[PDB]
Paper text:
We determined that prominent gut bacteria express homologs of the mammalian InsP6 phosphatase (MINPP) and characterized the enzyme from Bacteroides thetaiotaomicron (BtMinpp). The Vmax value for InsP6 (178 μmol/mg/min) is the highest yet reported for any member of the MINPP family, being several orders of magnitude greater than that for the human (0.006 μmol/mg/min) and avian (0.7 μmol/mg/min) representatives (Ali et al., 1995, Cho et al., 2006). BtMinpp folds into two domains, an α/β domain and an α domain. The active site in BtMinpp is lined with predominantly basic amino acids, thereby rationalizing how the enzyme can bind unusually highly phosphorylated substrates such as InsP6.
Author numbering: 19 to 38, 48 to 424
The structure:
């Protein structure tokens, strides 16, 4: 289907997909829901280009239309940047709703749940929407709710690690990304529909215009604004745009060889915390029925690769090949989430199921009863992942 594939090409801007025994505990991490754009850079650039053209009589008919809409968008986004949208809230109500309905026993009576979020409002509002749905279904829940910079160590590790911040900003992946954009993004066919003399434009300025335009269009379906630009581009053009953003995500935030696993290793404190909270619930030190955490794409992506969920930590030496093996939209769409579901069988042995975006995920260890894995084997495996992460990090101060 062309419709679903077009949405995929929004990559990490993709709206959460459609998703329409009982565990004793659920361990959760969840990106905020669908949001407004975080930066006005792409919009202003697209507008600076159009408006400068409207002066030198350089706009086509479709060009004139685009500019009017771009100006309007500029208005609608004003003061709204980075905020959670109505769609974002409904995504959370739906995730929480499906959990409640699927495991009513878990959240029945006076179950205790705890939730944390980062200081980022879109993350907090996400938690709120998620929590509000839960309480509505069972007003008798005990709920502990908190948030702030004090969770920076486990929810924003990507800001704390000096080496990573240097890598993300000025590291070796940049030139690679930039050469790949040049190869894959053919600007002129696209600019031809908005501008007279598309050929007069420099590849650099042309490439920027067109990237900014893809970015605007990519984010629009997340704003709950009844406007659409997905139509300005052909499927192939979206395919190409996406391949480039996909490569950026992979190299900047995941297991690309050029990153040396630095982007993945930084998530070890979060994995560590996940294991502790489950162990404490297993021992009975804690007695929560669920821990929920609300954070970002930058939290989810490396976390998932660090968990070793199959096809997320792959190390692809060749850039042009990443799109085949690693799909950002499958990992970190809007409202992306990981849930560990813990079960106890008839003989008291603990099993765990790993859901990524509410689909059962695979680990590179064996089980006689997929999708359930032995908690003991699993924890040993995660503990190895963590120890590897600590070494990786030790190689980079």
């Amino acid at each position: 289907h062309m419709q679903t594939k077009i949405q995929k090409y929004a990559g990490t801007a993709m709206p959460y997909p459609n998703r329409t025994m009982t565990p004793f505990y659920i361990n959760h991490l969840g990106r905020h829901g669908a949001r407004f754009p975080t930066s006005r850079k792409a919009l202003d650039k697209v507008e600076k280009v159009l408006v400068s053209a409207q002066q030198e009589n350089g706009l086509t008919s479709e060009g004139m239309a685009l500019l009017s809409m771009i100006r309007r968008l500029s208005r609608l986004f004003d003061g709204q940047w980075g905020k959670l949208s109505k769609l974002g809230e409904t995504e959370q109500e739906g995730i929480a709703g499906r959990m409640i309905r699927n495991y009513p026993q878990l959240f029945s009576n006076s179950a205790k749940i705890e939730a944390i979020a980062t200081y980022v409002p879109r993350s907090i509002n996400s938690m709120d929407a998620f929590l509000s749905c839960m309480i509505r279904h069972n007003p008798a829940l005990q709920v502990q709710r908190s948030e702030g910079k004090q969770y920076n160590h486990i929810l924003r590790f990507f800001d704390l690690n000096k080496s990573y911040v240097n890598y993300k900003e000025k590291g070796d992946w940049l030139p690679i990304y930039k050469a790949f954009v040049h190869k894959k993004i053919s600007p002129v066919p696209i600019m031809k529909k908005f501008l007279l003399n598309p050929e007069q434009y420099l590849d650099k300025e042309a490439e920027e215009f067109v990237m900014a335009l893809f970015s605007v269009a990519a984010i629009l379906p997340d704003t709950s604004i009844p406007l659409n630009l997905e139509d300005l581009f052909t499927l192939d053009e979206w395919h190409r745009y996406w391949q480039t953003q996909n490569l950026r995500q992979y190299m900047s935030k995941s297991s690309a060889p050029v990153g040396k696993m630095l982007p993945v290793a930084i998530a070890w404190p979060l994995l560590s915390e996940f294991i502790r909270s489950a162990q404490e619930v297993i021992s009975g030190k804690s007695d929560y029925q669920a821990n929920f955490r609300f954070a970002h794409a930058e939290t989810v992506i490396p976390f998932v690769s660090l968990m070793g969920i199959e096809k997320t930590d792959v190390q692809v030496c060749r850039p042009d090949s990443v799109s085949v093996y690693w799909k950002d939209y499958e990992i970190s769409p809007m409202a992306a989430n990981v849930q560990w579901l813990f079960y106890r069988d008839r003989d008291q042995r603990i099993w765990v199921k790993i859901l990524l975006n509410e689909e059962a995920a695979a680990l590179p260890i064996s089980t006689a009863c997929f999708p359930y894995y032995s908690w003991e084997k699993t924890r040993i495996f995660f503990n190895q992942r963590i120890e590897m992460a600590k070494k990786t990090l030790s190689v980079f101060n």
